[PDB]
Amino acid sequence: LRATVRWDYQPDICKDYKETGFCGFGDSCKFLHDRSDYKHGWQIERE
Amino acid sequence: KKRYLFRSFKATKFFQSTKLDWVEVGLQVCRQGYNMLNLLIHRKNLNYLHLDYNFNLKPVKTLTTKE
Amino acid sequence: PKVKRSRKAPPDGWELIEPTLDELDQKMREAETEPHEGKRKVESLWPIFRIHHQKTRYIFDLFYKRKAISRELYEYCIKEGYADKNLIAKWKKQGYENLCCLRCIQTRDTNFGTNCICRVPKSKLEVGRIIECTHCGCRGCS
Amino acid sequence: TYNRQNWEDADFPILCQTCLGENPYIRMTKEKYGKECKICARPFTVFRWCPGVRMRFKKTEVCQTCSKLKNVCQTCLLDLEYGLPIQVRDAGLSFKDDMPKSDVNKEYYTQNMEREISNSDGTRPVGMLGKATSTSDMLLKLARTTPYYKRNRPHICSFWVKGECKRGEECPYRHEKPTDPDDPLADQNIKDRYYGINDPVADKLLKRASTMPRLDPPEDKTITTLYVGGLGDTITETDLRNHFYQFGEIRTITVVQRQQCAFIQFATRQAAEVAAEKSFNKLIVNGRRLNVKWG
Amino acid sequence: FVDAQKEDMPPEHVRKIIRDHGDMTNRKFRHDKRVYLGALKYMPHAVLKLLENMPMPWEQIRDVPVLYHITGAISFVNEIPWVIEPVYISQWGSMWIMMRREKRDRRHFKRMRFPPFDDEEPPLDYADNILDVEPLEAIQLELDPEEDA
RNA sequence: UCGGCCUCCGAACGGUAAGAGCCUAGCAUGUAGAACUGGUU
Ligand SMILES: [Zn+2]
Ligand SMILES: [Zn+2]
Ligand SMILES: [Zn+2]
Ligand SMILES: [Zn+2]
Ligand SMILES: [Zn+2]
Ligand SMILES: [Zn+2]
Ligand SMILES: [Zn+2]
């Protein structure tokens, strides 16, 4: 019943956008701009 | 100079010799390598990382910048 | 049971010697399945050599002390891993007839380059105390 | 950025007679950089051996520089000349030497003393031995003469304490009851034993040595005439005169075999006090031991 | 004896040692832990010696001499694979013939999946799974008893 | 009744501060040591 999935383990979210709502880089932010508290796949599979 | 490594290992008291089926030896090498990569990870106190079995390094949780 | 590496016909006197080794092999399986918790670090390897010693002694008892088995089946039992060739060759020497293990006379395994003290004869013990060998559990094999 | 403690690698360990054992033929093991020093924390050459038949496989604990500094054994941490704790010897001779306790200062001081010893002849316990010329004050009274082999006894089997030693007589550890855990003699910090600070064995031996008045005398009301008992007819007035000639001028020297007492009196109070202290259960002349008291 | 060489002890000794020290979690095997790290310095050599001695497709079971640490930290294959060159070339030519015949004759060749075991499936014990099962057949071109006598 | 020539190819750092100390993990050691009371003006 093993169902292991090789994930991509680099969640590229802007931490400044995630808990503030403002990023100093603006449109030149390397990571994506999203504010949500959903769990990741490895956090779900670990739980 | 020749300097045979395995004869130097067999000259000491920490090494022994036997005869073994090759599949058992390969399982022993894979288990030993996985066990000691976990030992290196636990030596560096990186309990939030995890080695797979198929040698896939993954974090358990989301990491801080120090981690 | 044991998977035979030769994959050929076993020799003629095999069928009356094959059950005993088989249950000896089952004893070896018990030595592979005992829990290591409780005894010591070095105690858990103590039966295995002894069981192997017993196996080798049985084939020795078929060939020299009784001469009741053929030469080629004795070579087959050597080649199938049922007996140790080096332990048998040490057993044919004069002073080494009830040798516990090949490891226990190895002079490269000790700190001072000596043998173990279960190779010391019991009349020359000179220290007292119940002696049990750390390599193999031997109590005076000389 | 290029200062660190050098690793002490040398042969020929400095041990007591008691920890070395009694056999003239000892089989000896040496590791080049096996363990660290228990005091100065440097790596050092570790020596391990069995002192006898049923002993403990004793091994060296402190490095050779610390043991050459305090003139002690590498295992027992007791003095080589007398077999005493270094707190007792420091109370006997000098307690103003001291050593730092913080690790950087301890490493710096140990490196400086190691460089001083390596710039010296090689085997000398600094000028402290120059302060150790005066001896036999009271330390020779309680010093052991026989090799106390009972500290080479093996450890107590902890499985037998819980009553689960399945080895039985095969177990090399001791199958006997331990000491009292409520006793304050059982604490025994190693750094406290090395530094000579609040060691309970040293306090117990100091209390034992303080209760033996081998140099008190002075039981007369300003009278220099003291009686030494135990002399008898074996010791005459010539031995008393030869003993009192080192103190200077003697007022009266006589021996009486009726009471077996030697009457000694000096014209000086300090010479009579020195003669009473030298003859207070520590003087043996002509096969007769003398104990000084009032007469 | 002037000197005795180091001989071979049974494989149940090393099998019991590898059966113990299970993922280095027990406190009884604490003192071996540092020794178990020292095999970063020598498992490239163990990989090389293991992978050069992999069995050929006409072999079912190949037994090798193994030099192993007493704590079970590492296990080198202590041999060099020596072959006679015309026998080796003829064996691989017979292999080539049966592979061409098998790809001509099999209706649906199926590749085995990769990886064969999952990332949380634990590695199988040799004695519990492989030591007591009969191996399958090798490739093994049958020869003419008259022509290839 | 007249020709063949065929580079590439992906990962890390570079961005989601730093310090701090309170209980907490993991990990090191398997230690050195237990000395006890006696003499006449
Ligand atoms: Zn952003
Ligand atoms: Zn033995
Ligand atoms: Zn032995
Ligand atoms: Zn023996
Ligand atoms: Zn000593
Ligand atoms: Zn030191
Ligand atoms: Zn015990």
mmCIF file of N, CA, C and O in Angstrom, chain C residues 40 46 100 104 115-142, chain D residues 27 52-54 57 167-172:
data_model
loop_
_atom_site.group_PDB
_atom_site.id
_atom_site.type_symbol
_atom_site.label_atom_id
_atom_site.label_comp_id
_atom_site.label_asym_id
_atom_site.label_seq_id
_atom_site.Cartn_x
_atom_site.Cartn_y
_atom_site.Cartn_z
ATOM 1 N N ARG C 40 24.507 -10.044 25.338
ATOM 2 C CA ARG C 40 25.652 -9.129 25.254
ATOM 3 C C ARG C 40 25.842 -8.745 23.796
ATOM 4 O O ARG C 40 25.082 -9.190 22.931
ATOM 5 N N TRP C 46 28.035 -16.133 19.788
ATOM 6 C CA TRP C 46 28.570 -17.339 20.420
ATOM 7 C C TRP C 46 27.969 -18.675 19.969
ATOM 8 O O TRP C 46 28.756 -19.631 19.857
ATOM 9 N N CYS C 100 38.009 -24.898 18.872
ATOM 10 C CA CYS C 100 36.703 -24.250 18.866
ATOM 11 C C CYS C 100 36.444 -23.525 17.554
ATOM 12 O O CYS C 100 35.387 -23.696 16.938
ATOM 13 N N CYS C 104 40.136 -18.256 16.741
ATOM 14 C CA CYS C 104 40.609 -18.237 18.110
ATOM 15 C C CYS C 104 42.081 -18.630 18.222
ATOM 16 O O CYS C 104 42.680 -18.455 19.287
ATOM 17 N N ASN C 115 47.635 -16.245 21.207
ATOM 18 C CA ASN C 115 46.407 -16.987 20.984
ATOM 19 C C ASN C 115 45.384 -16.602 22.045
ATOM 20 O O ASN C 115 45.622 -15.734 22.885
ATOM 21 N N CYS C 116 44.223 -17.244 22.009
ATOM 22 C CA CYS C 116 43.286 -17.062 23.099
ATOM 23 C C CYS C 116 43.671 -17.965 24.264
ATOM 24 O O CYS C 116 44.488 -18.878 24.130
ATOM 25 N N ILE C 117 43.070 -17.711 25.432
ATOM 26 C CA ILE C 117 43.424 -18.491 26.610
ATOM 27 C C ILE C 117 42.586 -19.750 26.754
ATOM 28 O O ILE C 117 42.815 -20.528 27.689
ATOM 29 N N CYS C 118 41.653 -20.008 25.840
ATOM 30 C CA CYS C 118 41.067 -21.340 25.814
ATOM 31 C C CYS C 118 41.927 -22.328 25.038
ATOM 32 O O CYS C 118 41.593 -23.515 24.991
ATOM 33 N N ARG C 119 43.018 -21.864 24.426
ATOM 34 C CA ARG C 119 44.076 -22.739 23.947
ATOM 35 C C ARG C 119 45.080 -23.094 25.029
ATOM 36 O O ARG C 119 45.923 -23.969 24.806
ATOM 37 N N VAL C 120 45.034 -22.424 26.170
ATOM 38 C CA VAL C 120 45.896 -22.792 27.296
ATOM 39 C C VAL C 120 45.375 -24.091 27.903
ATOM 40 O O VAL C 120 44.153 -24.232 28.082
ATOM 41 N N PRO C 121 46.234 -25.081 28.157
ATOM 42 C CA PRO C 121 45.783 -26.300 28.838
ATOM 43 C C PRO C 121 45.341 -26.017 30.264
ATOM 44 O O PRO C 121 45.844 -25.107 30.926
ATOM 45 N N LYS C 122 44.374 -26.816 30.726
ATOM 46 C CA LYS C 122 43.710 -26.563 32.000
ATOM 47 C C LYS C 122 44.615 -26.815 33.197
ATOM 48 O O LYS C 122 44.368 -26.259 34.271
ATOM 49 N N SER C 123 45.653 -27.632 33.038
ATOM 50 C CA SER C 123 46.616 -27.835 34.108
ATOM 51 C C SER C 123 47.551 -26.649 34.287
ATOM 52 O O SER C 123 48.169 -26.519 35.348
ATOM 53 N N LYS C 124 47.669 -25.784 33.282
ATOM 54 C CA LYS C 124 48.535 -24.616 33.345
ATOM 55 C C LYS C 124 47.736 -23.318 33.362
ATOM 56 O O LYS C 124 48.198 -22.297 32.846
ATOM 57 N N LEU C 125 46.529 -23.350 33.934
ATOM 58 C CA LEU C 125 45.678 -22.164 33.957
ATOM 59 C C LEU C 125 46.223 -21.106 34.907
ATOM 60 O O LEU C 125 46.308 -19.926 34.548
ATOM 61 N N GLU C 126 46.567 -21.509 36.133
ATOM 62 C CA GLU C 126 47.333 -20.761 37.134
ATOM 63 C C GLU C 126 46.685 -19.451 37.586
ATOM 64 O O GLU C 126 47.353 -18.630 38.224
ATOM 65 N N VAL C 127 45.407 -19.215 37.279
ATOM 66 C CA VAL C 127 44.752 -17.965 37.650
ATOM 67 C C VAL C 127 43.424 -18.266 38.326
ATOM 68 O O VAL C 127 42.830 -17.391 38.966
ATOM 69 N N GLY C 128 42.951 -19.501 38.192
ATOM 70 C CA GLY C 128 41.609 -19.790 38.643
ATOM 71 C C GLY C 128 40.589 -19.207 37.676
ATOM 72 O O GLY C 128 40.888 -18.936 36.505
ATOM 73 N N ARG C 129 39.357 -19.063 38.196
ATOM 74 C CA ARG C 129 38.165 -18.437 37.606
ATOM 75 C C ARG C 129 37.593 -19.246 36.438
ATOM 76 O O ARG C 129 38.327 -19.904 35.693
ATOM 77 N N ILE C 130 36.271 -19.230 36.287
ATOM 78 C CA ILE C 130 35.625 -19.865 35.144
ATOM 79 C C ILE C 130 35.934 -19.039 33.903
ATOM 80 O O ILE C 130 35.659 -17.835 33.856
ATOM 81 N N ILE C 131 36.532 -19.682 32.907
ATOM 82 C CA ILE C 131 37.009 -19.026 31.698
ATOM 83 C C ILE C 131 36.054 -19.350 30.566
ATOM 84 O O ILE C 131 35.807 -20.525 30.268
ATOM 85 N N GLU C 132 35.515 -18.314 29.931
ATOM 86 C CA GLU C 132 34.717 -18.482 28.727
ATOM 87 C C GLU C 132 35.242 -17.508 27.684
ATOM 88 O O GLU C 132 35.361 -16.310 27.958
ATOM 89 N N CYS C 133 35.571 -18.033 26.505
ATOM 90 C CA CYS C 133 36.252 -17.263 25.471
ATOM 91 C C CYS C 133 35.328 -16.226 24.852
ATOM 92 O O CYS C 133 34.186 -16.532 24.510
ATOM 93 N N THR C 134 35.830 -14.998 24.692
ATOM 94 C CA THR C 134 35.014 -13.927 24.133
ATOM 95 C C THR C 134 34.744 -14.104 22.647
ATOM 96 O O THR C 134 33.736 -13.590 22.152
ATOM 97 N N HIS C 135 35.615 -14.810 21.926
ATOM 98 C CA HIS C 135 35.389 -15.012 20.500
ATOM 99 C C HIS C 135 34.280 -16.023 20.248
ATOM 100 O O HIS C 135 33.430 -15.812 19.377
ATOM 101 N N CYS C 136 34.266 -17.120 20.998
ATOM 102 C CA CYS C 136 33.431 -18.252 20.635
ATOM 103 C C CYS C 136 32.747 -18.950 21.800
ATOM 104 O O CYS C 136 32.081 -19.964 21.570
ATOM 105 N N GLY C 137 32.875 -18.459 23.027
ATOM 106 C CA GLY C 137 32.267 -19.143 24.148
ATOM 107 C C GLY C 137 32.998 -20.379 24.612
ATOM 108 O O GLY C 137 32.420 -21.175 25.360
ATOM 109 N N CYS C 138 34.245 -20.571 24.192
ATOM 110 C CA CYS C 138 34.975 -21.787 24.509
ATOM 111 C C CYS C 138 35.470 -21.766 25.945
ATOM 112 O O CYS C 138 35.883 -20.725 26.461
ATOM 113 N N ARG C 139 35.427 -22.927 26.591
ATOM 114 C CA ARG C 139 35.939 -23.105 27.946
ATOM 115 C C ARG C 139 37.018 -24.177 27.888
ATOM 116 O O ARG C 139 36.757 -25.344 28.180
ATOM 117 N N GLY C 140 38.235 -23.769 27.532
ATOM 118 C CA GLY C 140 39.361 -24.683 27.491
ATOM 119 C C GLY C 140 39.272 -25.737 26.408
ATOM 120 O O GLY C 140 39.072 -26.918 26.701
ATOM 121 N N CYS C 141 39.408 -25.328 25.151
ATOM 122 C CA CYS C 141 39.271 -26.259 24.041
ATOM 123 C C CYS C 141 40.529 -27.071 23.775
ATOM 124 O O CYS C 141 40.497 -27.965 22.924
ATOM 125 N N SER C 142 41.627 -26.790 24.463
ATOM 126 C CA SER C 142 42.836 -27.579 24.301
ATOM 127 C C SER C 142 42.799 -28.811 25.194
ATOM 128 O O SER C 142 43.394 -28.824 26.270
ATOM 129 N N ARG D 27 52.728 -6.836 30.452
ATOM 130 C CA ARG D 27 52.393 -6.666 29.047
ATOM 131 C C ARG D 27 51.624 -5.364 28.890
ATOM 132 O O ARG D 27 50.662 -5.117 29.623
ATOM 133 N N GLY D 52 47.774 -6.988 37.407
ATOM 134 C CA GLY D 52 47.928 -8.273 38.054
ATOM 135 C C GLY D 52 46.978 -9.324 37.528
ATOM 136 O O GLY D 52 46.732 -9.403 36.323
ATOM 137 N N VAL D 53 46.432 -10.133 38.428
ATOM 138 C CA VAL D 53 45.626 -11.278 38.025
ATOM 139 C C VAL D 53 44.156 -10.913 37.910
ATOM 140 O O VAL D 53 43.530 -11.132 36.870
ATOM 141 N N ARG D 54 43.578 -10.351 38.964
ATOM 142 C CA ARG D 54 42.154 -10.047 39.004
ATOM 143 C C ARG D 54 41.914 -8.549 39.098
ATOM 144 O O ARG D 54 40.967 -8.098 39.735
ATOM 145 N N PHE D 57 42.261 -3.621 34.619
ATOM 146 C CA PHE D 57 42.867 -3.007 33.426
ATOM 147 C C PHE D 57 42.913 -1.481 33.558
ATOM 148 O O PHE D 57 42.202 -0.744 32.878
ATOM 149 N N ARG D 167 25.985 -13.895 34.485
ATOM 150 C CA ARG D 167 27.283 -14.526 34.292
ATOM 151 C C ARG D 167 27.710 -15.315 35.521
ATOM 152 O O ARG D 167 28.409 -16.326 35.391
ATOM 153 N N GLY D 168 27.291 -14.883 36.707
ATOM 154 C CA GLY D 168 27.663 -15.546 37.941
ATOM 155 C C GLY D 168 29.130 -15.389 38.278
ATOM 156 O O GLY D 168 29.645 -14.270 38.343
ATOM 157 N N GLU D 169 29.823 -16.509 38.465
ATOM 158 C CA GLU D 169 31.253 -16.485 38.744
ATOM 159 C C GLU D 169 32.093 -16.159 37.518
ATOM 160 O O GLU D 169 33.285 -15.869 37.664
ATOM 161 N N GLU D 170 31.508 -16.203 36.322
ATOM 162 C CA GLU D 170 32.201 -15.776 35.117
ATOM 163 C C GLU D 170 32.353 -14.260 35.056
ATOM 164 O O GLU D 170 33.273 -13.773 34.388
ATOM 165 N N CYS D 171 31.499 -13.516 35.760
ATOM 166 C CA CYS D 171 31.518 -12.054 35.729
ATOM 167 C C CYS D 171 32.771 -11.517 36.405
ATOM 168 O O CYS D 171 32.994 -11.800 37.588
ATOM 169 N N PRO D 172 33.610 -10.750 35.702
ATOM 170 C CA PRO D 172 34.835 -10.239 36.329
ATOM 171 C C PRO D 172 34.592 -9.099 37.292
ATOM 172 O O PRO D 172 35.481 -8.794 38.097
#
